[PDB]
Symmetry: C3
Subunit: 213 residues, 3 copies
């Protein structure tokens, strides 16, 4: 698994759900995280979609020692550099690029990049990768699609994201090739907006519970 401090495998096998977080106000990051954790969810993915995602990754790293925090929507080696220094323990990207793969392979934290087509998977596999966001899952054809896609690649394992809700997420967790999924429902904007971490903790717990049979 390269020059990486922890392996992409380990991030993706920590639990069934990785929350896809858009944090608008800096002061919410830390408690949000703890609520998440308190509710049994440890792999936090802060999307670089807000003005101060990095500040939030940075504080979650510093203050929530028990949470594995990483960065999503990482698009280029600069953003990768930036988030690695903020203290990101892994990165996720929506799709892959020769640079971003080159750079990630060179840096100190695992990157689980998004794919849609087999050509895409193959390119990332060329750089030694074996773990992938599959995104946008639903839109990409969902379950049936990913099974076709994983037909020729028995070694590779995914984490689907994009349109995954309580309603379909078990259909995904059911597949051989899926370790976990990413969704946005554990952190709704309006709960963040309103600091009601009571509610975040529970949406999380229910997500982790609802993930068995």
């Amino acid at each position: 698994m390269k020059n990486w401090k922890t392996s992409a495998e380990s991030i993706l096998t920590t639990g069934p759900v990785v929350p896809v977080i858009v944090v608008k106000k800096l002061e919410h990051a830390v408690p949000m995280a703890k609520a998440l954790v308190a509710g049994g969810v440890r792999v936090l993915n802060v999307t670089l979609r807000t003005e101060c995602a990095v500040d939030a990754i940075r504080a979650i790293a510093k203050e929530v020692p028990e949470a594995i925090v990483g960065a999503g929507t990482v698009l280029n080696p600069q953003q990768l550099a930036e988030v690695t220094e903020a203290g990101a323990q892994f990165a996720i990207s929506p799709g892959l690029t020769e640079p971003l793969l080159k750079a990630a392979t060179e840096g100190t934290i695992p990157l689980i990049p998004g794919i849609s087509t087999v050509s895409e998977l193959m390119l990332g596999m060329d750089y030694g990768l074996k773990e992938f966001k599959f995104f946008p899952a639903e839109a990409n054809g969902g379950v049936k699609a990913l099974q076709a896609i994983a037909g020729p690649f028995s070694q590779v394992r995914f984490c689907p994201t994009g349109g995954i809700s309580p309603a379909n997420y078990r259909d995904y967790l059911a597949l051989k090739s899926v370790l976990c999924i990413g969704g946005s429902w554990l952190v709704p904007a309006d709960a963040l907006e309103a600091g009601d971490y009571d509610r975040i903790t529970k949406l999380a717990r229910e997500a982790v519970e609802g993930a068995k049979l």
Copy 2:
């Protein structure tokens, strides 16, 4: 926006519809264009799918000063060179390649290249682009799909093409991330074949009118 005489933004915001043109006979190009224009449609896209697309781009450039003419189905830097010298004001491609992006970034006119996956978008974004054909729109999953696809990229704007008719085109023009669409219905082969520009002018006007609320 690079070393480009006019910006990709400006082409795509000129109006709601960009006609996707397949011109078989050279003598039809010019009047076709004027009919188009007369019917309020100014961004002409001549597809390099006919034996004398370039001759047509060339004459439209020379004679229809009020029309913004460009080239579609541009596949490589050669064809890009060729159409730039014919007087093309922009190019569109069905999908993107490291070369074709490299070359376009180097030349004198904006290229709005087609994408389907986020990895594709990202590669073109690496070269500084922010405007994209999204193609083939329908087949690619259509509306729902493009919204997922544009989830992580709030800055980027599309122009969908591929299966877009009077029936669905407003569903697209409705999206935040869509400036305009491309369709083939304003220039039907049989109208071209038959020189009935009366009809082209009107299909165009109705397209531009039917694009509000």
Copy 3:
């Protein structure tokens, strides 16, 4: 068609169906092939998905002189080297990569690589290719999809694979841009498992017969 001993065109036009083979036991390869052939099917595609695909390609090459044997799920130039030396007459891949294209273009046998998006097609077209697996066909949107995809590329011809059965395969063989298809139904695991080549021969014949009108 490059420095290739036989052209990609010729492989794909040999017949309508190319079987997609997963051979688990070495001793089955040869008779399987002959049954196939005996049933009028000559282009054999042994997928590099088993522990001894190469050994099987190798023996089919040596012993079934009348069968055109090739390798599927070829993912990198190494595997390409390997299978070329085993005696593979062509390769197929699930999707394409700059390396794998570079390397194939350099070697001695045609590679018909899988695509899903037009950007993908275009990249392979950059290296002079004109023949493509379209994969996974169904999941990729199927028929409608491939027609859109082949809209701008009248020269290119496909061989769809991925979800193709007796039920849909004529819908595909019907398209201008399709020379043939790939499916797994002519070689079912349990027939291989059980050496009942009686049955393989016939599933093949019926496939070739059922491919007319």
